[PDB]
Amino acid sequence: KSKLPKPVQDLIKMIFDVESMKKAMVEYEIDLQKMPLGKLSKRQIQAAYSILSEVQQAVSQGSDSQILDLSNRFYTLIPHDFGMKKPPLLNNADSVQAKAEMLDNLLDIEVAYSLLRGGSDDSSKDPIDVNYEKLKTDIKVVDRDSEEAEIIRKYVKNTHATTHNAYDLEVIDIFKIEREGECQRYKPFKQLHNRRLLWHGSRTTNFAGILSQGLRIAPPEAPVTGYMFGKGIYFADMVSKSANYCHTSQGDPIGLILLGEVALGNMYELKHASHISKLPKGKHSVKGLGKTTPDPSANISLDGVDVPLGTGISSGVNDTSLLYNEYIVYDIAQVNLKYLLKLKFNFKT
Ligand SMILES: CCCN1CCN(C(=O)c2cc(Cn3c(=O)[nH]c(=O)c4ccccc43)ccc2F)C[C@H]1C
Numbered sequence: 001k002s003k004l005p006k007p008v009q010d011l012i013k014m015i016f017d018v019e020s021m022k023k024a025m026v027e028y029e030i031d032l033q034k035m036p037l038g039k040l041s042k043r044q045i046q047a048a049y050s051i052l053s054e055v056q057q058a059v060s061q062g063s064d065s066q067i068l069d070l071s072n073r074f075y076t077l078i079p080h081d082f083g084m085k086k087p088p089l090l091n092n093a094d095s096v097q098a099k100a101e102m103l104d105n106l107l108d109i110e111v112a113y114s115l116l117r118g119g120s121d122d123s124s125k126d127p128i129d130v131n132y133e134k135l136k137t138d139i140k141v142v143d144r145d146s147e148e149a150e151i152i153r154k155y156v157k158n159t160h161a162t163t164h165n166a167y168d169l170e171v172i173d174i175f176k177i178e179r180e181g182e183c184q185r186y187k188p189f190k191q192l193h194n195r196r197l198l199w200h201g202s203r204t205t206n207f208a209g210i211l212s213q214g215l216r217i218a219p220p221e222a223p224v225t226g227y228m229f230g231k232g233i234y235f236a237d238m239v240s241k242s243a244n245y246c247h248t249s250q251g252d253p254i255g256l257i258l259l260g261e262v263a264l265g266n267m268y269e270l271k272h273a274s275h276i277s278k279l280p281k282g283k284h285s286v287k288g289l290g291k292t293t294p295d296p297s298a299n300i301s302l303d304g305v306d307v308p309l310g311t312g313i314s315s316g317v318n319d320t321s322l323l324y325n326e327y328i329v330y331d332i333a334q335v336n337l338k339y340l341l342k343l344k345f346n347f348k349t
Contacts, residue, residue: 016116026081234327
């Protein structure tokens with residue numbers, strides 16, 4: 001019987017939940033009868049990315065006769081639940097982004113499931129502890145009365161956007177997390193200027209992969225047109241922006257969100273989509289300029305790292321696609337994951 005704290009045990013149950021993985025697959029219209037969770041593999045996913053990169057090609061350069069063949073070959077690699085079908089045609093930039101998002105999620109599910117079916121079987125040990133070891137991550141419950149908790153709750157309290165007012169958030173648990181060897185990976189960037197504590201939200205079925213592998217970049221095979229600022233790791237300074245990417249609902253209202261230390265450095269600032277393969281010389285990150293920004297006068301420091309937890313104000317930026325800020329790094333060593341919060345979404349709709 002596990003001696004880990006209850007909060008940590010409920011987190012391990014959540015993230016290694018096999019039924020939740022399957023639920024996510026049918027959310028993306030996959031056929032589990034033909035492509036079940038156990039049949040999933042990296043090279044099928046990478047091949048699908050490549051077929052999706054070809055559909056990208058033909059969309060950019062403009063016919064519905066040829067596209068049909070490309071579209072069909074995508075469905076061959078990743079079976080969808082359409083019966084005797086004629087499935088929907090993949091003929092635009094949206095469809096490319098939608099299937100790229102699915103394949104991102106499938107990659108993290110394969111990793112989680114592979115940990116689950118890899119390794120040893122020992123009935124004397126609590127499965128919770130066994131699965132905790134597979135994450136190679138030290139998780140400790142942050143105390144509610146501590147100063148680091150007060151700052152984090154104030155970051156959540158102050159940075160909920162008016163346009164995301166369909167819900168509010170309760171911080172249920174705050175975990176301090178330390179991935180094995182990540183501090184050693186981060187070392188070159190640790191004293192770099194413009195380090196910031198930023199949100200990353202993701203569905204709970206991705207977190208086993210995230211805590212085992214770290215936040216990763218989408219692979220070479222993936223279509224760079226499927227991501228607004230190319231293939232990097234994306235963070236926000238407004239909690240609700242990242243919270244939306246949990247994909248919680250009335251029938252699934254508990255989510256997970258990270259706080260990471262992100263070495264932004266010299267930010268290449270952008271107002272509109274720009275599907276870059278690499279930064280311009282001397283830039284360490286992209287900053288997608290939002291219309292609203294957290295108040296710069298209210299920046300607080302937590303362990304020498306800036307925490308932009310001021311209330312939302314006007315940035316004074318005019319012709320921008322983004323309502324709120326957005327931060328992207330393109331080297332995975334520029335991220336050091338610091339906290340993990342478990343959130344209860346109170347939907348009012
Ligand atoms: C192997 C799949 C690795 N994934 C792919 C998507 N990754 C992203 O960083 C990413 C995430 C999003 C969506 N997204 C998001 O999922 N969570 C956020 O907190 C977020 C914040 C600002 C802007 C976008 C956000 C869009 C495009 C992206 F490239 C890295 C990683 C989580």
